[PDB]
Amino acid sequence: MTTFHDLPLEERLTLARLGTSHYSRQLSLVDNAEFGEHSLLEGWTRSHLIAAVAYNAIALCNLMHWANTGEETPMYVSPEARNEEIAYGSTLNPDALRNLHEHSVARLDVAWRETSEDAWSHEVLTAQGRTVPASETLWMRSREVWIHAVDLGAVATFGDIPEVILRTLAAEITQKWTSQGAGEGLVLLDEPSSTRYPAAPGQDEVVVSGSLAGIVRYAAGRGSDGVTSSTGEVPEPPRW
Template identity: 60%
Template sequence: MTQSFHDLPREERLSIARRGTSHYSNQLALIDNADFRSPSRLAGWDIATLVAHTAYNASALVNLVDWANTGVETPMYPSPDARAEQIAYGATLIPDALRNLHDHTLVRLDVAWRDSSEQAWDNEVKTAQGRTVPMVETLWMRTREVWIHAVDLNQTATFSDIPRVVLDTLVPEIVGKWSNTGAGEGLVLVDSESGERFPVTPGAETTEVVGTKTGLARWATGRGAHGVNADAPQPPRWL
């Protein structure tokens, strides 16, 4: 029986987010300054761009936490264009400045969570994709971000490092996103260990992707087909 991240006690979710942040930080520490222009595992992005993106994501989540605590509407980003411009600017910073940005933003987010009122966790905010969610959702948003991008830093992290409850939540979430956007019609993901099936379009299952939960998560997020059947197609975009 799988367990969803969202069903865990809040303190446990917060702990997984913090562990993910530490894991990501440790991977970042392995990178020499001279290698910040090297490719990350995220197609089209070098290490500097990825580090800037992940740091600014923390700042954007602080906006949502502040919104929940004050009642003053504070979007994650002013606009999609502003978000892209911010990341592009951050990618031009020297490596030491990017490391400082990382350190500063992760502390800001952790302090914002720490100082939130009990009521604020349930107050509704709006994500950059326009979803209305309780502020506690920021724990999942950051958890997903840091555990996956730790792998994208292209050092020693792998999907096998990601806690099982994160993988168990991530795979059906991605399938649900595909279903909602009309992508991946006919795909069904099959957990080779449990036999659990995750159809994108129930009743119209024509293409099976079979693998461990780790392999399915890696494939579904577009990070490679290791761990799934050799004839698995390219996955649709999910974010």
């Protein structure tokens, strides 16, 4: 069971594009009058979310420009500028936002298509300070669209997400917790495939199990409906 990272570039691009079309189908289902409503993500109106996704596309465009020119161009100007722009974007009218999403998507795809072979392996920095090859943007964008498609609150689910992406997410989230010493003793279990995704080590083990879609929804902090606990009580997972 390979991860997204070991897939050929073309398959990674296809998954990012499929995720975007999936996300866009959900956005199409949301009515303009519903943009001001809460998303399924706590603390985000749909407008905030929609804007954030577009700004993520622009941010990934920056990394691809850095990769293709060799000139450093960070994802975001600063943490502040980031939030301030999302705040601005969230105020725009529904159609302006739909146009921003559409155009930002189109521009990122062009950036990927015109990227050179060497550029794909060019080293860049993510907003979280990670040093990765430019190709990482294919994964970063897939992570964004496939998951936020669910947050839009139309009909998308974690079950809709290709297994290779869910597996990669299960590993990434728990690896992140581990690196930060979070989730001592907590272990996610993909029961059908008998695959454990442990967090930081601890004396008291607590296994949260279910289907892959179930444990990823749980780990991503979007609900425990798809899982059960070995102690009879599902604890709140570390934040992500």
